[PDB]
Amino acid sequence: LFMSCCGMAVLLGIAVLLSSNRKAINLRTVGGAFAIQFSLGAFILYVPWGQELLRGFSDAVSNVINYGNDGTSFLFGGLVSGKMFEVFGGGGFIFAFRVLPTLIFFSALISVLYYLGVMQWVIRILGGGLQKALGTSRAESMSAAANIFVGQTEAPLVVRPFVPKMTQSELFAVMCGGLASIAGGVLAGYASMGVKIEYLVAASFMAAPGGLLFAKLMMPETEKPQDKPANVIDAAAGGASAGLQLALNVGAMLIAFIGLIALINGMLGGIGGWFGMPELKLEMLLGWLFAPLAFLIGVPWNEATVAGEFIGLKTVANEFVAYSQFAPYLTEAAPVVLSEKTKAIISFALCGFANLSSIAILLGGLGSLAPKRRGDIARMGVKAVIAGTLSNLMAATIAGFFL
Amino acid sequence: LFMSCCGMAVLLGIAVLLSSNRKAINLRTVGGAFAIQFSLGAFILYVPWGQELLRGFSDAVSNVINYGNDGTSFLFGGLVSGKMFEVFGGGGFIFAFRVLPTLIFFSALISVLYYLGVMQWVIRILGGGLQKALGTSRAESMSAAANIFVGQTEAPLVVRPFVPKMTQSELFAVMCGGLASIAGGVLAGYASMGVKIEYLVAASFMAAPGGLLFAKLMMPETEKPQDKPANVIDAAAGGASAGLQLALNVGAMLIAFIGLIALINGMLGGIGGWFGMPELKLEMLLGWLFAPLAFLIGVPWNEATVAGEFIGLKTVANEFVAYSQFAPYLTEAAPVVLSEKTKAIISFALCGFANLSSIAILLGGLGSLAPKRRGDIARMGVKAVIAGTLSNLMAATIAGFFL
Amino acid sequence: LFMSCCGMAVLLGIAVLLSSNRKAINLRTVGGAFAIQFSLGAFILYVPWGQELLRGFSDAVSNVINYGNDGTSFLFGGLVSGKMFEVFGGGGFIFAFRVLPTLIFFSALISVLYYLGVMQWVIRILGGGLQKALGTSRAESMSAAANIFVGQTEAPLVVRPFVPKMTQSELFAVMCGGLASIAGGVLAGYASMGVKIEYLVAASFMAAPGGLLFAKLMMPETEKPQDKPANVIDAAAGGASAGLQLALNVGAMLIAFIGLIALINGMLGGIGGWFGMPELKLEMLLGWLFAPLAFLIGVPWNEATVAGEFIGLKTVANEFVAYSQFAPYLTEAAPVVLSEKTKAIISFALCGFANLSSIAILLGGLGSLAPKRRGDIARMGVKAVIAGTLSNLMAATIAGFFL
Ligand SMILES: CCCCCCCCCCO[C@@H]1O[C@H](CO)[C@@H](O[C@H]2O[C@H](CO)[C@@H](O)[C@H](O)[C@H]2O)[C@H](O)[C@H]1O
Ligand SMILES: CCCCCCCCCCO[C@@H]1O[C@H](CO)[C@@H](O[C@H]2O[C@H](CO)[C@@H](O)[C@H](O)[C@H]2O)[C@H](O)[C@H]1O
Ligand SMILES: CCCCCCCCCCO[C@@H]1O[C@H](CO)[C@@H](O[C@H]2O[C@H](CO)[C@@H](O)[C@H](O)[C@H]2O)[C@H](O)[C@H]1O
């Protein structure tokens, strides 16, 4: 457990070194933020009552997923039935029909829960508890709590009239809240790929204090902060349309990226052959390079390289592509049998939208909420991705600690 | 037959009660409009020659559908072949590949028929006959006749330079013409789901006088009314693109709505359990609530509840979702064997875009044709949906009368 | 071989007759342009070393195609596996999952190769060699060389600040470069349909001098010519999104057009029956009408009619629809066994975006680069399509000559 605590120290250390003003770091804020994330981890991953609450929220999500599967079962019929496994076997699981439509249903549901005020009610509680404990501003705290369920570009919408005039520290924290977390739609998508829901739900909740933690470490507050569809069926329709667009984007990206990686590996096998390494692939490079990082967060020495392949791929590309390559390692047909703790660490370290491509996404979604602040987003973009990555790594170290 | 005639009376009665000026109702207009819709029903559903003309137009449509299926058979190959039924059985029918591509072909065809002037030629005849018999204005009569073949947002395009300056009664009638009818694309889609084409074609034609009927009952005229692609291949391309966008929208909606209903039923089973009704579902509620309405339009007492499930679902959601749940009741594997008359009544009462979500659609499509008239559309939106619903119910009562 | 040389003469003759100023035709330009296209044909289709270089570039493309297929194999699983052929046979090949996703991968790859400067490097060499040999301007020469790999609306992007002010001859040549060629995305798509890659690669390269040839014949220069994503992963993402949109457009078009042709044939069988020709179809008309044209470019007398069906369909619709009907003639289950030379001629004569529908496309893509020049594009549109068609026919005659 000493390797984990040192891992937490190193991650905190990098944040301080990369700070904009280490002397401006509020010790109440970053102290409690780490305290909450650690206590939350101790709660739902260690203590009996906390584990019972986590398995109860996950089973509820797992039921919602199955209910939404009635929709895709209607559209694609027997292509998503059980006979697909008899005829095709492992290839019977058609990713395009099994996972992608889940993004559509969950986007429509969340859109409904927003219209009913259910989402706002939960966000107001989680967000209000953070600002009264960390001293963070109202707007950045709501966006942090919102990011537990929705994406990086949808979370600030709950405080969109406060975005164009919020401080650079607030705006940075807003960027970090979305980079450290995921969305409810893709969450259910990853769960359909074999990723344990308990880990996804946990990592999503720990993202709110964790996102604020490294946001106020690398960018402390130095300024002075301040302070709809016609019906429920329209809300569902709008959410379904937004999910469809997302589902198409994710699908095209996976076809391209995986294909590109396959092209890269083919070239790496030829270039590597010139130096006596014809078996050279992208996984080997990412694995060999992220193995120390994986070893630092609590992954065993003999599993650090394989774990480095997935964590590295999540960074250089995105977490969806990483999960796509990590999903086979969660079944009985896995090429490498990993320990249950390592499976948890990778699941937590991948659960985040933290990647270089998300900077252009933050410029698009969050940038449209404050067009005169696009210059500040592009400037703090790199620092925000790093801050988001550290939050995922910390959540993985905490998870590995209590497991 | 006395229950049907009383049904017609009640439907007419509600329209008068909900009128904007019952004293301004032109008895020539609403008298002939009901006369035409009833005579049209008597024509193609009773008399020998009229039935021969209806079965001839439906077989032509059925052939066009099969011709368009050569396109989807090319793209999806064996996934839409006969071997799918051998391997999967009932689940062999893949809705996404069987029904959705039909929207693309029929949208491209109608776009072609517009370029050739074939559509305008038929509309000018049907629309001109209505205005000379009902006294309705030129523009609202053309949009009424256009709505037989095209959707609510495409029909007013034949009279789009007259929309921004037409009276509130004209604009309301335009809204009602599209709410009371469907489109040629989705028509072929419903036909591919097992819905009898003869009913769909009939209901589509009866929508023109029926739409004007309840438009001039709930909103009589109190003011004084007034009065392109480069080639045919481009027209087909533009229509195909519009159909594709529609096909994606419908598909995502069905995945979401059906999934949401599945989620609602799961919750209704838990909430209902608190009051000793664990088998409580959405179908039971909609059925129990729309049973008197179904019984009023001519559905037998022992079939009013089941029929109420579909009619209610068409209202609270849309007719596509309703048809999706009603389609299994048209096959030999139906959970409840319905009478041939009841099957007709449901088919006519569902054949319409009349739902609450269509108000936002009218604001989008029709609203773009008259941006300064969006306030009037949103105001008369609710009344227009009711007026559109009554037209479908009347067409169902007339159909049930002559059957 | 005398029929081929006469074919080249006739094609050149039509260009001179349709010229804007036959007396303004630069004999250095059009002389060398035909010389290069003919020599290029003599190079990679006749001489040993040239054939070895063509088979080497095609095998590289064929490997890239297979690497990209790892992406679609992930998304669609067993629907693109080998068991599909066992269960369905010929219908096992699902076009929607086999060919369409290739457009997505190749669009993402080209987008990456642009970010790395690899594309610009090759274009600068091929484009620079043309302008120093033909005397053509810098901008139109780069767009000509760019068109070898990318589409008609993407090629002028390498010289987009020179488009609004370039002469009518330059703008026309730019239009012709894209009409005479295809794109790298659809190229790999056609290759997946059975079309020989060697022919597609060859025709793509011969399009650059061939496009300029008939551009400076039908529109000689009479005036005086003048003279980015944040990272590589964003470039791949943007290219994947553009490919997805293209893949959806192509798919919807094929469903519609093939379905429309099926509808046309059904009507032609009824109309033709009135004149004692009930077997009358669209293929017969296009075949009987384009048979002299096919016979002129080097197709045997007994194969000119069948070849006329495909060439005609490429013109009246597009090359994708033509390739879709020509692809079965490349397998062992072909209804008509064609000679290897005829298979090459059709492959070269179809390899082009030259169709009437591309005028509206040039108005959209190229028109957005110069909004005040849309009037000139629409004016020279028809002449440009003809000029693009002649370039494909010439490349087919040259190919048939050396084979
Ligand atoms: C298919 C998967 C295979 C794995 C391949 C992994 C390769 C990753 C390459 C990353 O390259 C850098 O990414 C930054 C991302 O933004 C860019 O910064 C750009 O954007 C920054 C953010 O604002 C600015 O600070 C910079 O000035 C600006 O160059 C930068 O140019 C670019 O060199
Ligand atoms: C998945 C299927 C499950 C079945 C569920 C069925 C539930 C239906 C709920 C309908 O709710 C109402 O719908 C109106 C629709 O427009 C809204 O009116 C709104 O729009 C009207 C039209 O302009 C205005 O008159 C109103 O002021 C404005 O509130 C209104 O707010 C809303 O309460
Ligand atoms: C599914 C496949 C079945 C095969 C069917 C084949 C039928 C082909 C019909 C072509 O018709 C012409 O195409 C031109 C294409 O543009 C149009 O020119 C239009 O555009 C030109 C280009 O700018 C202008 O010169 C013209 O004035 C303008 O009429 C023209 O109107 C139109 O009559």
Ligand SMILES: Nc1ccn([C@@H]2O[C@H](CO)[C@@H](O)C2(F)F)c(=O)n1
């Ligand atoms: N709601 C969502 C879901 C996804 N994404 C972007 O898509 C990538 C893969 O999920 C994520 O890495 C991404 F975050 F970049 C997004 O921006 N918003």
Ligand SMILES: Nc1ccn([C@@H]2O[C@H](CO)[C@@H](O)C2(F)F)c(=O)n1
């Ligand atoms: N041409 C069309 C077709 C459909 N729709 C809308 O989609 C719902 C289901 O068909 C219809 O209920 C709807 F009407 F709302 C539309 O607006 N226009």
Ligand SMILES: Nc1ccn([C@@H]2O[C@H](CO)[C@@H](O)C2(F)F)c(=O)n1
């Ligand atoms: N990159 C591309 C690819 C295709 N297209 C258009 O689509 C038709 C079929 O490929 C082509 O005929 C077309 F050219 F018209 C395009 O414009 N640009």
Ligand code: NA
């Ligand atoms: Na989030």
Ligand code: NA
């Ligand atoms: Na209509």
Ligand code: NA
């Ligand atoms: Na090109």
